[PDB]
Structures are given as structure tokens and as C-alpha cells.
Design a protein around this ligand. Structure first.
Ligand code: CYC
Ligand code: CYC
Ligand code: CYC
Ligand code: CYC
Ligand code: CYC
Ligand code: CYC
Ligand code: CYC
Ligand code: CYC
Ligand code: CYC
Ligand code: CYC
Lengths: 81, 172, 162, 272, 172, 162, 172, 162, 162
């Protein structure tokens, strides 16, 4: 759904910070329990950004901040440590 | 990511002109440096395990507080991860040597490694010292006199030393 | 940005291994072809303005309807002719970028990706750009390994647009 | 499924399989178990050597820089998955392998295969692999932190009934894999997926038949699913297009000669 | 997958014997013809869309039953499927030419393609006729003497014709 | 098995695209390397029995404990020496296969993958095979591009064992 | 999947001409029957749980071997799956009634249901009996004249009955 | 192939629940639209030959180079004119199928999916079909709900091509 | 939530496409049903207190054990009767909300999802609420278009509880 894919520049990584992930008729579909709703950090490449945004949006999550990384590696995520 | 050609391509496209004569002459100079570059990559790849092992051994000899019971490089798992990190740093410096541009080295290995190491409690000064020891081993095996036809190979050695210097600067 | 060195490093990173002699042979082919690519890009840079003007004239000769019929997508006015010359200059410049790089990576990242949305949204016929690339393929004047490399990018953009 | 069905079908261990979820602040044992479960399920129970174990994405999980989904994507986008399931396989087989590994499912219909083939042709292997992980079904079923597992033997919300019968044609057993000799496998679903039908399951103890005194010298039966057409000689009236033949060993070569002389095509031969 | 070298390697390793002198000489002759092989691959790649469009035009000119509503190639979706099948078959024929062995073309493309076309209702005879006219067009553009140095190329043309014939035979 | 031609076809197939000039350059480098690799494999085929016997003897000099100490994993008896000669013959034969193929793919798919389990399970020390490969580096007797490509394969199995 | 309009669209596109005036008049008659169709869907949906519970009660009344220890409907898991199966069969019958075509019922529910029930051990004759009991329950609540304006409803009742014997014939 | 009844059943199956009053409202809107859709399909069926010939003539009027320049993709000869008339009959026939069905599903399954590589491969300009669909806009003669329902399917094919 | 407009937009977003004439038919059915739903919700709002008290009395008549037996889950004291009237008020108010919305969306968001844990944790028999909703079905007083929309929601919560 993007022209970014099949491109080196489309491997630019970003971090989405999303809040408010809660059960809803849109979330009633999920087969697994969600454990955190405070501040979820997801690393997303450029090509995959459209998919991630829709996915976050479809579930009702609210995006607070998107931090650029200037790298293909997810090393400056540093949230699960 | 970029190499020695596509970095100049991306800069010329972002400025929106053709490559100038001096840019093509510098690219031809790196083309003349290419066989030296492939020899350096081949030598570093051929002695990479010895470089990692000897640099880790000398690093733990100079700083014994790392492998001490309770140190970061203690426990097979963490020591093994430290040897793995030496292999990753050496592999991406080899990648940057191969491409001629360090874009693979920052954009896939060095971007966020310092914040990761200070999150994990990994001492980045010892990692930088191990990168320095890997650098010394790499420039001794690249500039080895025997076993290869002679030539003035100072430019590729200086570029490799710059790659190791920015690898050590991105963890300390 | 596909390129022999970049695909070599990307593939060896995908296995996560050191650079074996397969990647060294990739580099050897890149270094032997890189000289002919560099003087091909130099010759096309020297002949760039004449090639762009001749390609625009060849497109206006094969497709005269762009010159008399009015519209944003057509080149009836000076604005449309300037846009067409800028487009052909973009095509030739990215072909020179591919000659410098040694692969269709500049074409993929800069021109080929999303060009269908360009030709659909702005009502630009891709056959115009195809005939511009055929003029560059017919009147650039390269020979040997330089011409075989340069035509390969010209037909690749032709194959992408057709 | 319950005990009596899964004991016959040989899918007991799939039904008593707990989906591994990598919780936050997990111990190295839990991360190792998640990595091993991903290597078992995404790489299709292959004997995975340590030389292609993907240490970088393993450290990215250990590091918590990537999620379980990212690790699954990294594994499926690696050259281990390309060599094992993509390069020597045809497109139908590769799409079925992607469904089994990433989504834990058999494909439901031919337009799904056409969509994935079109997406491969339009955007490469990377785009195609992403299609499965960045799908609504993956996010709902496994999401970011649950290791994918086979869901074809359970009742799913948006599933086709033919998916349950096709899951046995895709999942051959617990001690099976998706590797073949030469790493090139043909799809078992192309006859039905294209035609929107189903085959009998015949999995494990389901495949067995009663022998008695009719089995011949070797007390074993052979099971032949054969598509039958009208014979040119018109000697015997054909009553059904799809026919079942249970024949002994001592008549198996003769029966194959009969089916080949009748012009009928053999679709399945198994033990019974 | 296998190429002309790794097929030889696999056949030698199944016997567990080193390569003989004559088999190494056959590989050396393959390396000598490799330049012509790359030229033929480059020509079919550069004329791929022309070959596919011209052979599609010819195939639907001689076979109107694919054009009429109800025909397999009727509907933008199914005609796009026919066109991508033609580009797919051309791409894997060029891959088999590039490798020197038909392992990628047999295992990756033609494995189960006949039963796939039977089950979908695709007329494999029409696809085989399209493959034959792609063969005829591609062997015209490979054997074009203009714009290339002169030389005998009958071996690589016969190899390309063999890959095209095994592509048409594995479909119908 | 990885090879410049097979990896070029694999990368173009995973990208779902025709063979651009990048893969042509990869094949050009393979053709440049291939004659020297085939002649190096021919020379190692000619000197294989002397190299294998000398490598077994050199391992018995540097690691003498395999010769006196009894055990299934050692070469104290004739069976252990025969198994050691068979192992070194395998190592040199896969090296010649790598020289023929022009990549480390024979080493990966025949020897490197899973060798740690063979060394751990059967109590074989990898340092013995490392010393055997160092002997083969010492006395293969190749020159130029032949010795550079061979010693890459020799060091690739050395780095995988160490 | 198809409905009553897209089915005729499908074979009209297959034979490749416009819809005839008789087909448009038949679809106009379908539109006239559509309010009665929506009424039937609404009443079966409104009494779906009553239908499933009463049909399960009757089915396990005249077939006491299924609920008997060791029976297919014995155990909370198998009884929950059986009640779920009746609810899904009723759901897809309402789907096919709603569309006016049995494409959703045959393609997504009834395809492979005989093979699934043979594989599990589910007796298809018992499921066919339960589907039949659901058929008289649904046809009695559809043909109930209380609380609805009067009219001729034999066509939609015959269509619902046809979908119900389609469901009953696809398990046994 | 999307349609009010079909995607109503598809989404009710997606949450896996019975058909609530939402889907009944969807079917009620389908019923109030379907008589006008069937009348529009009947009127287009009776006027189809004149509409297709007039649309082809309007394309030839705005794009005369199709009738003059030689080429396989052009209508300069009788073969290209029959191909163009068959294409316009296809566009009108799937528009009538969309009027019968009540959604753009026949356009999606039969016409819209894959038409971009149809136009790219066979060098067909989508602006020709855009002008033909705008003639079908201008000259179908419908009024009321039948005109607006038909114009949805016309403009959907306009927005896909342009 | 489950509403024809929101489900239509959610489906068009699921395919990622513009609103075709299908969604316009969905909104047409919503518009023709919405006035009847609004007057039904107004009548239920105006008869709300009488309907809630009558439903509580109908439950206490059919289930008299909720009146005399002591317990938190029963209506033996005034607190239990107040909770029962509050529960039936929630049921009736969500039914009016569904009449206003045009789908079972308020029932899914507020009542249906999670009611099983309410009935198990607090020991509430769902048959009490099912008989209360039968009372609302019996005595809402609507006719024709209004009652069939309201009985759809009353049966939806009955079939969910049973
Ligand atoms: C003793 C039986 C034989 C022997 C041993 C020897 N070991 C090493 C070096 C290391 N040993 C370890 C092992 C561990 N580190 C851990 O954290 C844990 C878990 C708590 C274990 C089991 C490690 C990590 C090293 C290397 C780092 C270091 O030096 O500490 C050596 C030195 C090797 C060198 O090259 O410097 C030796 C000699 N050697 C023998 O001959 C005995 C038979
Ligand atoms: C050893 C005594 C013999 C032998 C073995 C051999 N096995 C394989 C491959 C596989 N073996 C299995 C078996 C299991 N996998 C499991 O997870 C379980 C537990 C339920 C079992 C029992 C599987 C699945 C495979 C294939 C997948 C994989 O390789 O992991 C091979 C490899 C064959 C190949 O060509 O790749 C071999 C050689 N071979 C012998 O000669 C001995 C007699
Ligand atoms: C008419 C407005 C202009 C014109 C048209 C023209 N079209 C073609 C060829 C094709 N058109 C299609 C289109 C469809 N096929 C379908 O199945 C459907 C859905 C039902 C559609 C819309 C296709 C597939 C082809 C190619 C295959 C074929 O020949 O049938 C041509 C011929 C192109 C060629 O190279 O042979 C022409 C000329 N040309 C004009 O000049 C008009 C302005
Ligand atoms: C054109 C010459 C003829 C024709 C073709 C036609 N093909 C299909 C469908 C498929 N073709 C394939 C083959 C491949 N797809 C791949 O990705 C690869 C390897 C890269 C191969 C070998 C497949 C898998 C399909 C099914 C998936 C899909 O539908 O896209 C069709 C569609 C038939 C249908 O409607 O179901 C058609 C029409 N048809 C002709 O008439 C010409 C002779
Ligand atoms: C007794 C305490 C009260 C009572 C009970 C009652 N139960 C049923 C019906 C069923 N009970 C079950 C339960 C099980 N089935 C199982 O397989 C297992 C696990 C081994 C359990 C726990 C089931 C499945 C049914 C329904 C199917 C059937 O009829 O067998 C009823 C009949 C309900 C009906 O509508 O026919 C009754 C009356 N009733 C009381 O009043 C007691 C206070
Ligand atoms: C596939 C494996 C392979 C490789 C890697 C390879 C490299 C290679 N390096 C070369 C040259 C060379 N290599 C060097 C390098 C050096 N000289 C020094 O004294 C320094 C210690 C050192 C820098 C690390 C020099 C100076 C030349 C000659 C100049 C040149 O050819 O560029 C040559 C030219 C032929 C020759 O004279 O040997 C080749 C082919 N050939 C192969 O087949
Ligand atoms: C993209 C390439 C890549 C990089 C660069 C990378 C680095 C990296 N190093 C890590 C850990 C580590 N790295 C070390 C390294 C050391 N400790 C020391 O004392 C020495 C100074 C040094 C080696 C010389 C240690 C000890 C850990 C484990 C930290 C812990 O678990 O407590 C981790 C955390 C996950 C894990 O434990 O494996 C990452 C992600 N991972 C990757 O995939
Ligand atoms: C990256 C783009 C690129 C390509 C593809 C390329 C191919 C290429 N083809 C060559 C030769 C050749 N090519 C042919 C091919 C043919 N001769 C004929 O008359 C037939 C019409 C035709 C078969 C299709 C022959 C006969 C040779 C000389 C023999 C040989 O070098 O193998 C050569 C040797 C140098 C030369 O003499 O031109 C190169 C470099 N060089 C490049 O830079
Ligand atoms: C496409 C829509 C769809 C259908 C049609 C469907 C049917 C279906 N019914 C199943 C099981 C079952 N179905 C029954 C049903 C019955 N047993 C009886 O004795 C009665 C005669 C009958 C009820 C009237 C039982 C008992 C099982 C469980 C079998 C077992 O686990 O052992 C299963 C096995 C997986 C599971 O347990 O969830 C499927 C897939 N699933 C679907 O997604
Ligand atoms: C969203 C909820 C909803 C629904 C479901 C609904 C259905 C509905 N059914 C109707 C008619 C009808 N319904 C029936 C049905 C029947 N007549 C019988 O005697 C049989 C017992 C039965 C077959 C099950 C008939 C005969 C008509 C009149 C003819 C027609 O309008 O098609 C009408 C026309 C208006 C009217 O006269 O009442 C509507 C609106 N309206 C709504 O708001």
C-alpha cells in the first residue's frame, strides 16, 4: 500500500509511542490478552509505517510521539531494558 | 544504506545536479584503491575469529573487573554475548571497509548502541577498548608485508582505522 | 539502492556472517565494470543538454498531440515543455547515477518506485518517456562495456514503463 | 479438538499446546523458550543448526528492542527461510508454507493464493512475507508478543470449514517438517484450492482400514483417491467422478495398470 | 538451488570424489562461454517487456478463445495473471540461462505448474504456445548481430532453446 | 549452496525482478575468479593425498596426545588414524568444491553447518582440524588469485571452527 | 461469494452479454420478495438461541447415545462445540437467506463439513437430524402470522427450506 | 466482489455473529436502490450499441492520433477500432453488472484489478477510457436515482483510471 | 461500534478505499429506518419508568424466589429491588440507545460484552433479564416499523443471555 517498499530509504526506523490500548468491539476480535496500556513503544520501519499506523489506529490506540532513529537498527529503543 | 558510489549519488541527487569531474576522479581513485580494499576485507575476514579472541583476551587481561563474578562479562551467557558483540562490531567494520562508506556501520550497528549499553549496564569504555584492540590487530594483519604483492596501501588502512575509531567513539 | 557492494553487504548481513569470497567476486565485478560506468556517466554528463533537448524533440515528433492540444499534462505551452525537459533531465541524470553506482538502485529509489502513480494521477503517458529513453539509447554514442551498461539502465526504465 | 477426535487424528499435542507470550521483564529462560518456539514453528520444525541461528535478531529480542512479531518477521525474512521454503519451492507451496508458519493456518480459497502471488510479483519476497505478519489475522491471533502456533485444528472466527480439512493436508504430524529431499516440495492443496472443494482427511489412524482375509499375503491395504472419467470403451458404467479404491499389495500394480488404462488420474495413494 | 558449478559439486559430493580433469575442462569451457551467456541474459532482460507484449499479442491473435468473455485470459485480473505468467516464465528462463543449470526454473517455476494450470482451468497448450513464441522472439534478439562483437553463439542459443522447450513441455 | 551466480539469482528472485546489471557484474566477477579457482581445485586434487597425509602427520606433531592416549575419539589405533585421514580428506574435498563453485556454499551446506555438534558429541577437538587447515595453508603451493581464493576457504573453516 | 444479483452477474459475465429483460424482471420479483426475506432473516435471528436450544434438546432426546458418556456430545467441550455447530449452521442459513444465494453457505460453511465430521467422529446423520429440527423450528417461526402484516410467503419459505436441506445433505 | 448484501454477510461473519438490524438496514437500502439500478441497467442495455459507438467516436474525436498513427495499441485500422469498441462494450457491460449488483464489485473483480498493467503492457492510454466513460456520463439519458447510481460506477472507473 | 454508518466506514477502511454506492445504500437504509427508530426510542423513553417497574414486577411474579430468599444477588430487601430496577433501567436505556443508533452497538459496547462475568461473579441468573426483556417486548406499545426494530434489539440481548 506504499511505494516506499523495495527501497533502502524505506528501511528508515521510527519509534511509535501509543497509549490507551483497551478492550473494545474492535479489540474483541483479539485472541490474546493485552497486558500494558500505559505507554507502548513499537519500532517501525518506513515501508511498514502505513501498516503500523493503521493497526494502532484500528485497535483504538492513540499515538503520542514518533521518534526518528536515523538507522536501520532498533538499538535506540531502550524501553524494555 | 550507501557505499562509496551511492553516497556521492545521493548527495548529487539531493543537490540535484550531475556528478562533477572531481567527483568522478575521486571515484576512479577509489576504484584504483578497490583491489587494496578487497585484500583488506579478505584479510580481516580470514583472521576475524583470532582478532575477536585475542582482543577479548587482552581486554579481560587489562580489565579483570569485567569477567569477575558479578562483572558484566561474567556468566557464559553474557561473556558469549560480549564475544558476539565483538563479532558484530568487527563484521560491520568489515562491511564499511567493503562498501567504502561507513553508512552500514552507523545505520545498522552504531546508531543507538551507546544508549543500549548504558541501559543494560554494559560498560562502554571497555567495549571501546576492545574495539581499539581489534583495530590494532586489524591494522597489523592488513599491513602485513609478506604474503601479498607490495603497494602503497596507507589510504585503505587509514580508512579502516577511521571506521574502528568511529566504532569506538559510538560506544564510549 | 541496489548496487553490487550494497547487495553483497545486505545479503551477508541477512545471513549475519562475514564477507566470504562470493562477496569479493561481487566486488571484483563491480570494480571492473565501475570504470566503464564512470566514463559512460562522464560522456552523458558532457552530452546531457543536447540529449535532453533531442529527446524532447523526438517525443514531440513521435507524439505531436502533446504540442497542440491544451492541458496540464501536455507540452503545448512553455510550462509543459519546461516540465518535459525537466522530466527527461531527471531520467538522464538518474541513468548517470545508475552508471556511477553500478546498478538500478538510483532508478529504483528515485524514479521507478511510484512512477505508476505519477503516470496515472497526472495523466502522463509513459510511452513519451519510453521514446525519450529510446532517443538516449540511440544518440548517446557510447561503445563497448560503457554502452552495454548504459543501455541496460535505459531498457530497464523502458521495461518498467512498458 | 477433544481427546477422542485428536487421538484418531494424531493432533493431540497441537490441542494441548499453550501459546507462548513474552511478557515484559522476562527472564532469559522465557526469551530462550520464545526464540526456540519461533524456530520450531516459523521454520516448520526443521533441525536448525547454530550456524544459521540468527544471533542478531536473537539479541534484539533479548535486548527487547524488537517484539515477538518482529522476531517472527526477522526469521521469515532471513535467508534460512528463503533457502528452506522459498527458493526451491513453487509459489503455491511457498504460500501454503507461509500460511502454516506465520498464520498457523491452511489457505481458505484460491483468491488468497492469487492475492499473495500478485503481491509477490508486485513487491518481492519481503513484501509478500510482510503481508502475512502485517495482516489483521496475525495481529488478532498472535499480535506483538505471542509466538504463532497452528490454529487450523480449532474453530476460528473468520475461518472456512474446508480450512480444518486442509490443515491435515498441511500439518502432517507432530514429528514432521516442511523440508523435503532437495528442499523442493509440491503443494497438496492445488487440486482443491483451485476448485473450492475438500479431500477426505485420512490422517494417521484415520487412514487405516479393516483388513480381514482380504488383505492378501501382506496384511496391509492401499488407499487410492482417483478422479474417474468416462471410459472410451464404455465397458463399465462410472457412477462417481471421484472414486475410492482399497486394494491389496498383490493387486496394487495391477490396479494402477487398470486406472492408467482407463485414463483416470491418481490423486492420492496411502496406507490403509 | 544449483548452477552449472554447484550441480557438478553436488554430483561429485554424492560420489565423494574430487573433480576429474575433463570435468574441470568442461567447467572451464562453460566459463569461457560465460561472457556470451551474460550477453544473452542482458539482451532478453532488456527486451523482456517487448517479448512478453509481442508474444501475448501474437497468442491472442491466433487464439481468440482466450479473448472472448469466458476465456481464461478474459477480465483484467485474469489477463494480468497471464501477463505476469509470461514475465515469470521469461524471468526464470533468464535465471536458468544465467546459472547454466535449470534447477531454479524446474524447482521454483515449473514444479507443479501443469497440475496448477489443470486445476485452475488454465489451458496449458496456449501457455506453451506463448512460451514458444517468447522463445522465437528471444532467440531473434539474442542472435541479433548489431551492437555486439561477432562470434559463434550456437551453444548458448541451444541452451536457451532447451530451457524454453522444457518450460513449454512442463506446462502443456 | 551459496555462489555468486546462485546468490545473484536468489536476490533477483526474492526481489521478483529480472537480472539487472548488478547481477551481471556479479557473474563477471565470478568469471574473473573462476579460471583461477578451477586451476587451484585441479592442483589441490593433484596434491590431495600428500596434503591429507601431511596434515594428519602435522596434527600428530602439534597434538601428540591423540596418538598415544586410547579412546574412540583419538587416533591411537589404525581405525582412528583412518578416520582422521577421512576427515581431512573431507575438509580438502569440500575446499576443492568451494574452489570449483567459487563460494563457501559447499562449506556451509556440507561441512560448516552442524560441525559444532559433531565436535561436541564425538569429543573431537576443533583445534585439530584448525591445525590441519593451517598445514593445508602452508603447503598447498598455489600462487596469485589461486592462493587468495583457496586461503579464504581455508580460513573460513578455521573461523567457523575457532 | 455471491448473492442473488452477483450470481446472475457472474454467469452473465461468463457468457459475456448484458442481462436479458426476463432476468431483470426476475430480479425485480426478488426485490419485491426482499421485504419478506428481511422479515424471515429477522425472525430467525430473533429466535436463533431458542431454535438451537430446542433443536439440541429434541435431537439429544430421540438420540440419547450422543449425550451418553463416551458419546460425541458428551463432555462440556464437545457439547459446547455441538451447540456452537448448530448456531453456526443456523447463522450461515440466515446468511444464505439474506443474500438470496447459497454461495456463502456452500463455500464457507458446507465445504468440507462432511470430511470434517468424518475426521472428528461427528455423526453426520445426527447433525442432519438436528438441522432438520432447526428447519421445522425456523419455518414455524417464519410462517407465524402473529405480529406481522399478512401476505404470500411460500417462495422465501421454500428458499429457507432448500438452504436447510442443503445444510442437512452436506453433513451426511 | 463487494455488494451491500455480500459485504454485510462478510462483516457479520467477520465478527462471527448473526445478522443484526444493521445488516437489515443495509438490505433495505439495497432494496430501495435496486429498482432504480435494474431500470438503469435496462436503459443502458437498450442504448448500449449507440452509447458504445458514440463513446468510441468521442475518443476518436478528442484523440485523433489513435485513428492516424500506426501501432498495435491504436485504432488506425479496423482491427484497432474493433478492439476499442469491444473495450467500450466491456466497460459499459460491467457498469450494467454494477447497476444490477448494487456495488462496484463487478468493476473490482472484472475491470479495476489489474488494469494498470493492462494499460502499461499493451501501451493503452487510460485517458481514452476516461473520455469514453465521460461520454457515458454525458449521454446515458437517465434521471433521478438511476442517474446518480450509474454515475457512481462511471466515476469509480474514472477515478481508478485517472 | 455496530452501526450501519460506522460499519460501512470500517469496511471501506478495511479495504482502504473510498465510499462506493454500496455505502450510500447502507446510509439510505439507515435514513429510512432512523425516523422509526427515533420515535420508538422516544416512546420507550416516555414509557421507561412504567416499563421498568412492570418488568421488575414480571420478574418477581415469574421468579418469586428472588423476593423471599435472603442473599446479595436476590431482591429480598429494598437494596436488591433497587439494583434490579437499576439493571432493567440499564437494559431499557441501552435498547433506546440501539434504537437511536440503528444497530446493536450500544448493546455490544455497554451490555452484551462482559455480561457473562456479571452473571457468574455476582450470581445473577440471566433468565430474570430474559423475562424482563420479554415484558418489554410484550408492552412497549409500538406498531409495525417501530416495534420490529425494537424487538430486534430485545431479542439480541435475549439470545446473548441465553
Ligand atoms: C580447567 C579444567 C582447564 C583450563 C581452563 C581455562 N579456562 C579459561 C578461560 C575461560 N573460562 C571461562 C568459563 C566461564 N566463565 C564464566 O563466567 C562461567 C560461568 C560462571 C564459566 C564456566 C571463560 C569465560 C574464560 C575466558 C575469559 C577469561 O579468561 O576469564 C582459560 C584461559 C583461556 C585464555 O585464552 O585466556 C583456561 C586455561 N585450561 C586447562 O588446561 C585445564 C585442563
Ligand atoms: C540417525 C540415527 C539417522 C538419520 C537421521 C536424520 N534425520 C533427519 C531429519 C529429521 N528428523 C526429524 C525427526 C523429529 N523431529 C522432531 O521434532 C521430532 C520430535 C517430535 C522428531 C522425531 C525431522 C522433523 C527432520 C527434518 C527436519 C530437520 O532436518 O530438522 C535428517 C536430515 C535429512 C535431510 O536431508 O535434511 C537425517 C540425516 N539419518 C541417518 O542415516 C540415521 C539412520
Ligand atoms: C478505445 C477506447 C481505444 C483503443 C483500444 C485498444 N484496446 C486494446 C487491447 C486490450 N484491451 C483490453 C481490455 C480489457 N480486457 C478485459 O478483459 C477487460 C475487462 C472485461 C478490459 C477492460 C485488453 C486485455 C487488451 C489486450 C488483449 C487483447 O488484444 O484483447 C487494443 C489492442 C492492443 C494490442 O496491442 O493488440 C486497442 C487498440 N485503441 C485506441 O486507439 C482507442 C482510442
Ligand atoms: C497466459 C500465457 C495464459 C494464462 C494464465 C493464467 N495464469 C493464472 C494463474 C496462476 N498462474 C500461476 C503461476 C505462477 N505464479 C507465480 O508467482 C509463479 C512463480 C513465480 C508461477 C509459476 C499461479 C500460481 C496462478 C494462481 C494464482 C493466481 O491466480 O494468480 C490464471 C488465473 C486463472 C484463474 O482465474 O483462477 C490465468 C488466466 N491463461 C491463459 O489463458 C493463457 C494461456
Ligand atoms: C441439577 C443440579 C439441576 C438440573 C439439571 C438439568 N441439567 C440438564 C441438562 C444438561 N446438563 C448437562 C451437563 C453436562 N453434560 C456433560 O457432558 C457434562 C460433563 C461430563 C456435564 C456437566 C448437559 C450437556 C445438558 C443438556 C443436554 C442433555 O439434555 O443431556 C437439564 C435438561 C435441560 C433441557 O432443556 O433438556 C436439567 C433439568 N435441573 C434442575 O432443576 C436441578 C436443580
Ligand atoms: C577472491 C579472493 C581474491 C582477492 C581478495 C584478490 C585480491 C587481489 N589483490 C591484488 C593486488 C594488490 N593487493 C595489495 C595490497 C596490499 N599490499 C600490501 O603490501 C599491503 C600489506 C596490502 C593492503 C592490505 C596491493 C598493493 C596490490 C597491487 C596493487 C593493485 O593491484 O591494486 C590483485 C592483483 C593481482 C596480484 O598482483 O596479485 C588481486 C587479484 N584476488 C583474488 O582472487
Ligand atoms: C544489530 C547488531 C547488534 C548489536 C550491536 C547488539 C548488541 C547487544 N549487546 C547486548 C548485550 C551484551 N553485550 C555485552 C558485552 C560486553 N560486556 C562487557 O563487559 C564487554 C565490555 C563487552 C564485550 C567486549 C554483555 C555482557 C551483554 C549482556 C548484558 C546483560 O544481559 O546483562 C544486547 C542485549 C541482548 C543480548 O543480551 O544479547 C544487544 C542487543 N545486538 C545486535 O543484534
Ligand atoms: C554490464 C553490461 C555488460 C555486458 C552484458 C557485457 C558483456 C560482454 N560481452 C563480451 C563479449 C562477447 N559477446 C558475444 C556475443 C554475441 N556475439 C554475437 O555475434 C551474437 C549476436 C551474440 C550472442 C548473444 C561474443 C561472441 C563475445 C566475444 C567472446 C567472449 O568474450 O566471450 C564482452 C568482452 C568485451 C568485449 O569484447 O566487448 C563483454 C564485457 N559487458 C558489460 O559491461
Ligand atoms: C465454517 C464454520 C464452521 C463450522 C461448520 C465448524 C464445524 C466444526 N465442528 C467441530 C467440532 C465438533 N462438533 C461437534 C458437534 C456435534 N456433536 C454431536 O454429537 C452432535 C450431533 C453435534 C451438534 C449438533 C462436536 C461434539 C465437536 C468436537 C469434537 C471433538 O473435539 O472431539 C470442529 C473442530 C474444531 C473445534 O472443536 O472447534 C469444527 C471445525 N467450524 C467452523 O468454523
Ligand atoms: C430493521 C427491522 C425491520 C424489518 C425486519 C422490517 C421488515 C418489513 N417487512 C415488511 C413487509 C412484509 N413482511 C411480510 C412477511 C410475512 N407475512 C406473513 O404473513 C408471514 C408470517 C411472513 C413471512 C415470514 C409480508 C407478507 C410483508 C408485506 C409484503 C412486502 O412488504 O414485501 C415491511 C413493509 C412495511 C410494513 O408493511 O410493515 C417491512 C419494513 N422493517 C424493519 O424496520
Amino acid at each position: 500500500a506504499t511505494s516506499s517498499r523495495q527501497s533502502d530509504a524505506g528501511n528508515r526506523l521510527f519509534v511509535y509511542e501509543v497509549i490507551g490500548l483497551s478492550q473494545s468491539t474492535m479489540t474483541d476480535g483479539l485472541d490474546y490478552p493485552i497486558r500494558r496500556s500505559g505507554s507502548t513503544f513499537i519500532t517501525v520501519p518506513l515501508k511498514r509505517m502505513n501498516q503500523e499506523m493503521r493497526r494502532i489506529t484500528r485497535m483504538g490506540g492513540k499515538i503520542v510521539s514518533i521518534k526518528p532513529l536515523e538507522g536501520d537498527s532498533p538499538l535506540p529503543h531502550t524501553e524494555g531494558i | 544504506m550507501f557505499d562509496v558510489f551511492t553516497r556521492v549519488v545521493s548527495q548529487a541527487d539531493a543537490r540535484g545536479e550531475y556528478l562533477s569531474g572531481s567527483q568522478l576522479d575521486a571515484l576512479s581513485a577509489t576504484v584504483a584503491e578497490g583491489n587494496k580494499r578487497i585484500d583488506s576485507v579478505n584479510r580481516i575476514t580470514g583472521n576475524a575469529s583470532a582478532i575477536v579472541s585475542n582482543a577479548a583476551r587482552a581486554l579481560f587481561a587489562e580489565q579483570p573487573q569485567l569477567i569477575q563474578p558479578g562483572g558484566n562479562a561474567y556468566t557464559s551467557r553474557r561473556m558469549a554475548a560480549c564475544l558476539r558483540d565483538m563479532e558484530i562490531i568487527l563484521r560491520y567494520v568489515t562491511y564499511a571497509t567493503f562498501t567504502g562508506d561507513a553508512s552500514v556501520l552507523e545505520d545498522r550497528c552504531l546508531n543507538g548502541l551507546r544508549e543500549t549499553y548504558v541501559a543494560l549496564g554494559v560498560p562502554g569504555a571497555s567495549v571501546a577498548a576492545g574495539v581499539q584492540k581489534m583495530k590494532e590487530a586489524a591494522l597489523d594483519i592488513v599491513n602485513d608485508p609478506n604474503g601479498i604483492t607490495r603497494g602503497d596501501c596507507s589510504a585503505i588502512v587509514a580508512e579502516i582505522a577511521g571506521y574502528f575509531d568511529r566504532a569506538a567513539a559510538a560506544v564510549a | 539502492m541496489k548496487t553490487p557492494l550494497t547487495e553483497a553487504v545486505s545479503t551477508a548481513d541477512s545471513q549475519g556472517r562475514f564477507l566470504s569470497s562470493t562477496e569479493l567476486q561481487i566486488a571484483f565485478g563491480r570494480l571492473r565494470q565501475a570504470n566503464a560506468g564512470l566514463q559512460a556517466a562522464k560522456a552523458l554528463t558532457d552530452n546531457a543538454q543536447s540529449l535532453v533537448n533531442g529527446a524532447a524533440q523526438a517525443v514531440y515528433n513521435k507524439f505531436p498531440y502533446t504540442t497542440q492540444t491544451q492541458g496540464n499534462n501536455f507540452a503545448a505551452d512553455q510550462r509543459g515543455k519546461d516540465k518535459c525537459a525537466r522530466d527527461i533531465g531527471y531520467y538522464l541524470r538518474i541513468v548517470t547515477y545508475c552508471l556511477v553506482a553500478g546498478g538500478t538502485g538510483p532508478l529504483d529509489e528515485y524514479l521507478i518506485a511510484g512512477i505508476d502513480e505519477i503516470n496515472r494521477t497526472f495523466d502522463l503517458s509513459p510511452s513519451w518517456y519510453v521514446e525519450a529513453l529510446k532517443y538516449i539509447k540511440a544518440n548517446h554514442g557510447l561503445s563497448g562495456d560503457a554502452r552495454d551498461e548504459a543501455n541496460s539502465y535505459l531498457d530497464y526504465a523502458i521495461n518498467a514503463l512498458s | 479438538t477433544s481427546l477422542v477426535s485428536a487421538q484418531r487424528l494424531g493432533i493431540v499435542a497441537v490441542d494441548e499446546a499453550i501459546p507462548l507470550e513474552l511478557r515484559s521483564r522476562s527472564t532469559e529462560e522465557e526469551v530462550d523458550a520464545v526464540i526456540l518456539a519461533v524456530y520450531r514453528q516459523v521454520l516448520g520444525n526443521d533441525h536448525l543448526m547454530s550456524q544459521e541461528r540468527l544471533t542478531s535478531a536473537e539479541s534484539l529480542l533479548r535486548g527487547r528492542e524488537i517484539s515477538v512479531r518482529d522476531f517472527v518477521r526477522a526469521v521469515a525474512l532471513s535467508e534460512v527461510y528463503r533457502q528452506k521454503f522459498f527458493h526451491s519451492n513453487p509459489q503455491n507451496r511457498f504460500i501454503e508454507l507461509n500460511y502454516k508458519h506465520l498464520l498457523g493456518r491452511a489457505p481458505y480459497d484460491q483468491s488468497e493464493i492469487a492475492f499473495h502471488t500478485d503481491l509477490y510479483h508486485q513487491g518481492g519476497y519481503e513484501a509478500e512475507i510482510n503481508s502475512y505478519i502485517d495482516s489483521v489475522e496475525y495481529t488478532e491471533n498472535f499480535g506483538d508478543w505471542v509466538v504463532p502456533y497452528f490454529r487450523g485444528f480449532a474453530t476460528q472466527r473468520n475461518q472456512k470449514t474446508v480450512g480444518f480439512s486442509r490443515s491435515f493436508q498441511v500439518y502432517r504430524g507432530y514429528a514432521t517438517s516442511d523440508r523435503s529431499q532437495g528442499n523442493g516440495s509440491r503443494s497438496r492443496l492445488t487440486r482443491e484450492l483451485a476448485r473450492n472443494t475438500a479431500s477426505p482427511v485420512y490422517a494417521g489412524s484415520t487412514a487405516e482400514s479393516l483388513r480381514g482375509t482380504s488383505a492378501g499375503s501382506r496384511n496391509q491395504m492401499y488407499r487410492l483417491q482417483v478422479i474417474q472419467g468416462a471410459a472410451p470403451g464404455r465397458g463399465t458404467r462410472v457412477r462417481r467422478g471421484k472414486a475410492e479404491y482399497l486394494v491389496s499389495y498383490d493387486n496394487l500394480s495391477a490396479k494402477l495398470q487398470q486406472i492408467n488404462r482407463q485414463g483416470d488420474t491418481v490423486t492420492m495413494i496411502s496406507l490403509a
